[PDB]
Amino acid sequence: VYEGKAKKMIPIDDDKLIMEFKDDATAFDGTKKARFKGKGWLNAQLSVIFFKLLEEHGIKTHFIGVAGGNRLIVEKLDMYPLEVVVRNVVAGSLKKRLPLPEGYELPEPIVELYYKNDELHDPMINYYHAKVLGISLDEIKKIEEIALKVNEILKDYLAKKGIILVDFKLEFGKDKNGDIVLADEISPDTCRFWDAKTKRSLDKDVFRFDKGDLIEAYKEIYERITGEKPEF
Amino acid sequence: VYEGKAKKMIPIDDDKLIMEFKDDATAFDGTKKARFKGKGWLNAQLSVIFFKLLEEHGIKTHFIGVAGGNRLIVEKLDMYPLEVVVRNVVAGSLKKRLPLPEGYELPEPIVELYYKNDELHDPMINYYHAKVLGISLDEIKKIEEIALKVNEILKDYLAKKGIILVDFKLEFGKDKNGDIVLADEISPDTCRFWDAKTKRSLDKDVFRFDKGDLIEAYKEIYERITGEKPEF
Ligand SMILES: Nc1ncnc2c1ncn2[C@@H]1O[C@H](COP(=O)(O)OP(=O)(O)O)[C@@H](O)[C@H]1O
Ligand SMILES: Nc1ncnc2c1ncn2[C@@H]1O[C@H](COP(=O)(O)OP(=O)(O)O)[C@@H](O)[C@H]1O
Ligand SMILES: [Mg+2]
Ligand SMILES: [Mg+2]
């Protein structure tokens, strides 16, 4: 059993594991910490909806099934040590890299690669760093191609629900066939979602910058997407 | 007349300018400052030697000629807002991006792109940031191809002189034909040079980290390269 900041990973056999979503939330390299009753449930359910949508569009994900509420069954993968960030609208750390205001609409998507490494606080890397880390150029290109395809599908789907997909973080791993498979989660923890009309955050930024009620914000996302009220 | 931290750029006509190398040295985003009599002369002379070597190998540079001691005549270019860093051996900021020790020999060269921007303290960017900045993918690829070719020529030439080319920073601009031209300088200010036998720094790191006599170090480079003693 691996216990992370947001989730628990419980081995089943050699082929699969249980991904359990906790109520814990962290920010700022994990220096800001809180708990939000029902957060795990919402993130689990939204991950499921997103993975299923993406699977219908021919994206290979680790999603296998549900294991009752806060737990997903997922394929075990040899993980790439990357966080792959896709950005449509300027926000967060991008403001420190390009002299563009928050809300600036990008002419095309930006993909950023981050090296998952706590010693180094997850630095941004490029393709040459990735190669030194054992990730070939073809693997990187395949990964960015998938991320960009995921972007189009999620942003289209969300725009039709009055939600702007500002940016989001993905993780990937390799399966036993050597195929690149989308992993981890897709939730208001790992994406920026803005209301189309008011431009307000319906995501982890509410917690990051004390913008109000996180659970309310995560509920509103769930309701706008499912059309139903959360049961917890 | 543009006065920078290390050099002066003096317009001649519309086609060319004077690049004058000053004795000033800065480090740590320009927060550490000193002057070293003769530094401008050494950097000017070594730039000339490097530009001429590179021109012989068919690298297009801005070098036109000499204008007496500390001044080079150079082609005026529409500069890319980039610093292009090529790395052969782990040193400097690379230690904070990859968990590798100083002196680690890289399996192949790393190219890093930095956005020249004082507001943002020159952040690292990738190809997607560059595109948003108006630099096309083909331009970036051409730039990295040149940097990597420059790397091979300088490292070979220096190894035959008992000097390890650890890493170095280049800058580029476009000429009136739309060609990508190597610009700025190539000196112990803009490269890491290590003695092959002892691994000691013969470059700006001497000043950066108070490792001894900078002018001596820059002189030793000049002598190992030219085979003559500096005249100043
Ligand atoms: N299909 C998968 N196979 C193996 N590991 C995975 C898979 N999906 C996600 N992971 C990893 O499981 C962990 C999930 O826990 P989490 O709390 O989100 O991360 P962290 O512990 O880094 O904060 C992460 O290390 C993530 O990279
Ligand atoms: N051929 C060229 N044409 C136009 N500008 C150049 C050329 N070569 C170098 N430059 C620019 O001239 C300036 C040289 O001064 P320097 O002191 O080294 O830079 P800075 O002022 O940024 O510290 C830099 O801004 C550099 O980008
Ligand atoms: Mg995580
Ligand atoms: Mg400069």
Side-chain angles (χ1 to χ4, degrees), chain A residues 2 4-7 9 11-13 16-70 72-95 97-118 120-175 177-196 198-227 230 232, chain B residues 2 4-7 9 11-13 16-70 72-95 97-118 120-175 177-196 198-227 230 232:
Chain A
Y2 172 92
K5 297 191 300 313
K7 307 186 300 291
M9 310 303 275
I12 291 176
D13 59 328
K16 62 189 79 51
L17 65 171
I18 290 303
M19 181 163 66
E20 184 188 298
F21 289 68
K22 298 191 292 206
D23 285 350
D24 308 307
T26 72
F28 310 119
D29 282 17
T31 62
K32 187 175 181 177
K33 265 180 266 153
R35 313 183 73 265
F36 299 95
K37 177 63 177 183
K39 185 189 77 76
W41 192 87
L42 292 157
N43 287 351
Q45 300 308 314
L46 289 167
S47 286
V48 166
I49 292 159
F50 289 133
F51 287 134
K52 288 178 171 167
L53 171 67
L54 296 179
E55 283 283 345
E56 290 177 336
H57 288 72
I59 301 297
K60 293 219 204 81
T61 78
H62 69 162
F63 180 70
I64 293 177
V66 286
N70 287 28
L72 318 198
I73 304 165
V74 293
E75 190 183 15
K76 193 193 174 190
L77 303 166
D78 272 2
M79 297 295 298
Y80 284 104
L82 301 170
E83 286 162 1
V84 183
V85 176
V86 186
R87 324 185 78 117
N88 299 312
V89 167
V90 172
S93 75
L94 190 60
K95 288 183 297 174
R97 215 177 284 283
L98 295 178
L100 307 167
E102 172 116 0
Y104 187 102
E105 170 101 304
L106 293 164
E108 64 274 313
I110 286 178
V111 186
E112 298 168 345
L113 306 172
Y114 292 89
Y115 173 35
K116 267 174 81 77
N117 184 294
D118 288 324
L120 303 168
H121 315 293
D122 299 342
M124 203 181 77
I125 58 170
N126 62 34
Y127 308 160
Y128 297 84
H129 312 287
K131 181 64 179 185
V132 174
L133 285 168
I135 314 168
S136 78
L137 182 58
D138 282 346
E139 279 163 286
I140 281 300
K141 282 181 179 170
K142 232 301 189 161
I143 286 160
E144 307 202 325
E145 176 180 273
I146 296 155
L148 285 178
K149 179 178 173 172
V150 173
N151 187 42
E152 289 312 287
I153 301 162
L154 298 182
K155 75 192 296 277
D156 288 0
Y157 172 90
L158 292 156
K160 289 199 262 71
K161 286 172 203 296
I163 295 159
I164 300 157
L165 182 69
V166 164
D167 62 40
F168 61 96
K169 179 286 285 137
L170 300 169
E171 292 189 16
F172 293 86
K174 271 154 89 152
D175 67 17
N177 293 332
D179 280 336
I180 297 161
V181 181
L182 178 64
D184 196 60
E185 75 184 280
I186 306 169
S187 70
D189 273 17
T190 62
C191 312
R192 288 195 173 87
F193 300 133
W194 286 3
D195 172 70
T198 80
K199 308 290 184 293
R200 59 189 281 264
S201 290
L202 303 171
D203 55 48
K204 201 165 97 169
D205 275 349
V206 175
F207 167 62
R208 280 187 196 99
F209 306 107
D210 309 310
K211 288 196 199 165
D213 192 302
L214 184 106
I215 284 297
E216 289 322 300
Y218 284 37
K219 273 197 276 173
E220 210 196 309
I221 283 297
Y222 183 95
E223 289 180 1
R224 289 225 228 170
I225 288 168
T226 64
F232 300 106
Chain B
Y2 172 92
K5 297 191 300 313
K7 307 186 300 291
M9 310 303 275
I12 291 176
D13 59 328
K16 62 189 79 51
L17 65 171
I18 290 303
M19 181 163 66
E20 184 188 298
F21 289 68
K22 298 191 292 206
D23 285 350
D24 308 307
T26 72
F28 310 119
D29 282 17
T31 62
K32 187 175 181 177
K33 265 180 266 153
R35 313 183 73 265
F36 299 95
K37 177 63 177 183
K39 185 189 77 76
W41 192 87
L42 292 157
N43 287 351
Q45 300 308 314
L46 289 167
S47 286
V48 166
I49 292 159
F50 289 133
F51 287 134
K52 288 178 171 167
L53 171 67
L54 296 179
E55 283 283 345
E56 290 177 336
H57 288 72
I59 301 297
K60 293 219 204 81
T61 78
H62 69 162
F63 180 70
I64 293 177
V66 286
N70 287 28
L72 318 198
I73 304 165
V74 293
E75 190 183 15
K76 193 193 174 190
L77 303 166
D78 272 2
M79 297 295 298
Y80 284 104
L82 301 170
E83 286 162 1
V84 183
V85 176
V86 186
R87 324 185 78 117
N88 299 312
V89 167
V90 172
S93 75
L94 190 60
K95 288 183 297 174
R97 215 177 284 283
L98 295 178
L100 307 167
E102 172 116 0
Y104 187 102
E105 170 101 304
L106 293 164
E108 64 274 313
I110 286 178
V111 186
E112 298 168 345
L113 306 172
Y114 292 89
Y115 173 35
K116 267 174 81 77
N117 184 294
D118 288 324
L120 303 168
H121 315 293
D122 299 342
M124 203 181 77
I125 58 170
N126 62 34
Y127 308 160
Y128 297 84
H129 312 287
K131 181 64 179 185
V132 174
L133 285 168
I135 314 168
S136 78
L137 182 58
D138 282 346
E139 279 163 286
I140 281 300
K141 282 181 179 170
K142 232 301 189 161
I143 286 160
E144 307 202 325
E145 176 180 273
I146 296 155
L148 285 178
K149 179 178 173 172
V150 173
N151 187 42
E152 289 312 287
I153 301 162
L154 298 182
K155 75 192 296 277
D156 288 0
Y157 172 90
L158 292 156
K160 289 199 262 71
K161 286 172 203 296
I163 295 159
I164 300 157
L165 182 69
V166 164
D167 62 40
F168 61 96
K169 179 286 285 137
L170 300 169
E171 292 189 16
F172 293 86
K174 271 154 89 152
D175 67 17
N177 293 332
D179 280 336
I180 297 161
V181 181
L182 178 64
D184 196 60
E185 75 184 280
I186 306 169
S187 70
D189 273 17
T190 62
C191 312
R192 288 195 173 87
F193 300 133
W194 286 3
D195 172 70
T198 80
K199 308 290 184 293
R200 59 189 281 264
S201 290
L202 303 171
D203 55 48
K204 201 165 97 169
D205 275 349
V206 175
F207 167 62
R208 280 187 196 99
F209 306 107
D210 309 310
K211 288 196 199 165
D213 192 302
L214 184 106
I215 284 297
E216 289 322 300
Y218 284 37
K219 273 197 276 173
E220 210 196 309
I221 283 297
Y222 183 95
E223 289 180 1
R224 289 225 228 170
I225 288 168
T226 64
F232 300 106

